[PDB]
Amino acid sequence: PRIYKPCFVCQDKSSGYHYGVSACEGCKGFFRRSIQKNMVYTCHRDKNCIINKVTRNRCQYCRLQKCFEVGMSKESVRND
């Protein structure tokens, strides 16, 4: 019944606020992983790649760039 602004990263339907922004379950999980797994991606284009529900899985580098850009907090990804 509760409506949230679209995922800030890919603009798909949001499950809620994840790491400071309205985010979809995909972008929440992706961000948690790139931080926990200390992933370092590379753009196999020119870094200007566009993120939306249909393309979000094509460039992991540009998807992680947008997570950061919109304001996802790396600090709130628990590390023990």
Binding site: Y4, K5, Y17, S22
Partner: protein, 79 residues
């Protein structure tokens, strides 16, 4: 039979010059003592009622003021 001017829940009496619930007294006490600033996720017109009051803290705090809760009525922490 008193009602909280802010959320509509049953009121105990006047707190910070306003008929309010025990929750709105507490939230305002916390906000003023800690000098807290909030941001509305939506368009600053969030429905503040018994159910949805904890959803947006911004709109709950702006409604406390609109219903006239005096920030000066909040004293400093005892010890």
């Amino acid at each position: 039979k008193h009602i909280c001017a802010i959320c509509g829940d049953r009121s105990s009496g006047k707190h910070y010059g306003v008929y309010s619930c025990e929750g709105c007294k507490g939230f305002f006490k916390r906000t003023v003592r800690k000098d807290l600033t909030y941001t509305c996720r939506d368009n600053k017109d969030c429905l503040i009622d018994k159910r949805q009051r904890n959803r947006c803290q911004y709109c709950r705090y702006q409604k406390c003021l609109a219903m006239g809760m005096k920030r000066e009525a909040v004293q400093e922490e005892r010890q």
